[PDB]
Amino acid sequence: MLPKDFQWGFATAAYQIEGAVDQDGRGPSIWDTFCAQPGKIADGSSGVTACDSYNRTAEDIALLKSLGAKSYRFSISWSRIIPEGGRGDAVNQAGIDHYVKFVDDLLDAGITPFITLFHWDLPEGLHQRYGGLLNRTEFPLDFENYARVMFRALPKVRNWITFNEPLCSAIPGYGSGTFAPGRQSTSEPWTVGHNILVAHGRAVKAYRDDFKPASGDGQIGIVLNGDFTYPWDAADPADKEAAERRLEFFTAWFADPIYLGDYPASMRKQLGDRLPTFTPEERALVHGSNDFYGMNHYTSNYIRHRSSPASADDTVGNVDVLFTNKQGNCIGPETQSPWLRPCAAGFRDFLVWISKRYGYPPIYVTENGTSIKGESDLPKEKILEDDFRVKYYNEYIRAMVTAVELDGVNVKGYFAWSLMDNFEWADGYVTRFGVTYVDYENGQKRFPKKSAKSLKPLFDELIAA
């Protein structure tokens, strides 16, 4: 049994699905720029058309009703709202009107919106003007303004997310250079993470002070990813330590400041002066800034300690991240994503880890899902019979249930990533995470896969009353 008010649905992100990249006054994001650069996207694609969801809102809502979703998690493209991005820049009324209409249409359908303000698509103008996410002074001020514009425009919304997966904005974006804006630095990821946390805190303070509804059901929080860890050699205290330290670098990086008031000591030890120090003002903003814990989770790994000190290029916490352990056991089967091996037990375990470290917060699992190896090469009929994905959902959802029932974890909602196949960042369109097939060659036509239909009967069995 899950509580009667448990919310479930599907998730998407604006740049992954919307298309219409220059329609109705939209300014370029750092992702539009990145895709234009050679060798960044595996299939040489971009979000130019994607699923054309910007132009197919009625169809997307009808699909959500068809599948029985209670809620829908999606993001706002900042550059549709303020094309240049800053607090002194012109606001694009057309972009605001689009999202206002969309939210109205969702609520008229009886589906609750869960809205992400920042899903990696920083307006290119802010990146050029002042170094974007790198600027400790300017980025938080412009993010807060953007947040205020959206809070003011969408007063019927009750569920807000500031940032989706800041680790992905920071490490791939400024560490390895694999995601936009494609920079490579031993310091920049830590600078970026800090500015995101401050930006987040400013936005939450603005929400709480000036916009939260009298009805009291308004809530705001950040969304953090994090895959679970198991020691390579469980009998080696060093591997136990290494597995814990890995979680700290992945997730506590963000959640420790938010719940506990500072960065993980292990990060401070390794990173030294490369990791910023909160001022009293910044700590006041960041400490206590989550009304709920937003959780993205996909996989687990075995973690092995290293015999030497960490290098400056290290971002994982000086450990080997592996798919096999000392006994030759394997985490899970291959998917199309080299990093993703299904391991339902790790989902239960991650929920408990968060709960124990952060005082049993209310948790929304804002992303969970899988790709299927070679899915895009399959004939249509075979893509639609996505048994691998059906099983992924069945097992992961049951693991979540175990965490709720036995471990007492306070899970409030669950969102399947994704409602439809979409632009999977540096993978392009080859990697499919959708419960819905999208035939990009034939006008982005949609076809629900087996997994899309499987979630309602599953949740109807679980959700009480």
CA 116 to chain CA centroid, nearest Å: 9
**What is the C-alpha separation between 342 and 79, in angstroms, rounded?**
35
CA nearest to 72, candidates 362, 366, 351, 389: 366
**Residue-wise burial string across 129-153, b where 16 or more C-beta atoms lie within 10 A, e elsewhere:** bebbbbbbebbbebbbbbbbbbbeb
**What is the C-alpha separation between 178 and 127, in angstroms, rounded?**
17
**For the chain, what is the HEC assignment?**
CECCCCEEEEECCHHHHCCCCCHHHCCCEHHHHHHHCCCCCCCCCCCCCCCCHHHCHHHHHHHHHHHCCCEEEEECCHHHHCCCCCCCCCCCHHHHHHHHHHHHHHHHCCCEEEEEEECCCCEHHHHHHHCHHHCCCHHHHHHHHHHHHHHHHCCCCCEEEEEECHHHHHHHHHHHCCCCCCCCCCCHHHHHHHHHHHHHHHHHHHHHHHCCCCCCCCEEEEEEECCEEEECCCCCHHHHHHHHHHHHHHHHHHHHHHHHCCCCHHHHHHHHHHCCCCCHHHHHHHCCCCCCEEEECCCEEEEEECCCCCCCCCCCCCEEEECECCCCCECCCCCCCCCCCCCHHHHHHHHHHHHHHCCCCCEEEEEECCCCCCHHHCCHHHHHCCHHHHHHHHHHHHHHHHHHHCCCCCEEEEEEECCCCCCCHHHCCCCCCCCEEEEHHHCCEEEECHHHHHHHHHHHHHECC
**What is the C-alpha separation between 217 and 237, in angstroms, rounded?**
45
Contacts of 175 (CB under 8 A, 6+ apart): 183, 184, 185, 186, 188, 189, 315
Q: Length of the chain, please? A: 465
Contact of 52 with 446, CB cutoff 8 Å: no
CA 420 to chain CA centroid, nearest Å: 16
**What is the C-alpha separation between 226 and 241, in angstroms, rounded?**
17
**What is the C-alpha separation between 441 and 206, in angstroms, rounded?**
44
Phi, psi of 302 (to 5 degrees): -85, 145
Contact of 227 with 209, CB cutoff 8 Å: no
**What is the C-alpha separation between 13 and 11, in angstroms, rounded?**
7
Token pair recorded at residue 134: 């790198």
**What is the C-alpha separation between 446 and 436, in angstroms, rounded?**
6
Resolution (A): 1.6
CA 10 to chain CA centroid, nearest Å: 13
Beta bridge partners of 304: 320
Query: Which residue is associated with the tokens 């904005």?
Result: 169
Beta bridge partners of 266: none
Contact of 248 with 265, CB cutoff 8 Å: no
Radius of gyration of the chain (CA): 21
**For 22-80, what is the HEC assignment?**
CHHHCCCEHHHHHHHCCCCCCCCCCCCCCCCHHHCHHHHHHHHHHHCCCEEEEECCHHH
**What is the C-alpha separation between 243 and 433, in angstroms, rounded?**
28
**What is the C-alpha separation between 34 and 173, in angstroms, rounded?**
10
Beta bridge partners of 10: 72, 416
Contact of 335 with 372, CB cutoff 8 Å: yes
CA nearest to 190, candidates 245, 104, 268, 284: 268
Query: Which residue is associated with the tokens 């000086």?
Result: 318
Please classify residue 425 by burial: count the beta carbons closer than 10 Å to its beta carbon, then call 0-12 exposed, 13-18 middle and 19+ buried. Answer: buried
Contact of 338 with 299, CB cutoff 8 Å: no
**What is the C-alpha separation between 5 and 24, in angstroms, rounded?**
38
Identify the CATH homologous superfamily for domain 1-465. Answer: Glycosidases (3.20.20.80)
**Residues acting as catalytic residues:** 165, 367
Report cis status (omega within 30 of 0) of the bond before 155. Answer: no
Contact of 371 with 420, CB cutoff 8 Å: no
Token pair recorded at residue 95: 């972009």
This entry's atomic model was obtained through X-ray
Token pair recorded at residue 233: 């050699």
Contact of 350 with 279, CB cutoff 8 Å: no
CA nearest to 246, candidates 314, 190, 339: 314
Contact of 339 with 299, CB cutoff 8 Å: yes
Strands 228-231 and 411-417: unpaired
**What's the N-to-C CA distance of the chain in angstroms?**
10
